[PDB]
Design a protein around this nucleic acid. Structure first.
Lengths: 62, 62
DNA sequence: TCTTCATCGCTCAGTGCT
DNA sequence: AAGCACTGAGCGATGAAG
């Protein structure tokens, strides 16, 4: 019946790792998009300085 | 003692809730910025159709 | 009714901070 | 030094899928 415990242990390890990695994934996505967002906003202001950038599209945290 | 167990049980609950809440937070942030990213990219194409899309800022998936 | 396994709550044994 | 909040992880109970 020790096998039942080892199988049980492995599953737990996988589940916890899956959640931790999912956490990092949304972090990596948010970081990458945030970088673009900053890159895009400036380039938009450069081409069309008269347009209000933060007025039409609010800057979302973080 | 029972006291040691009860405090740690509450702490464990708080800890699991903290991570779950952290995940939702990073999800909500990732979604919002992705939304902003799309909102920005579109407004860019409308104002300057001549500009090359994905060239200056590569469009990451998700 | 009985496996199989993903999730998770309880517990132990630390870890880090002060 | 030593109490405190916090958490990694083994364990067992539960849920969900076959």
């Amino acid at each position: 019946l020790e096998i039942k415990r080892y199988k049980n242990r492995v599953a737990s390890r996988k589940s916890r790792a899956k959640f931790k990695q999912l956490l990092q994934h949304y972090r990596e996505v948010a970081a990458a998009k945030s970088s673009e967002n900053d890159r895009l906003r400036l380039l938009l202001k450069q081409m069309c300085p008269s347009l209000d950038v933060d007025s039409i599209i609010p800057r979302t945290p973080d």
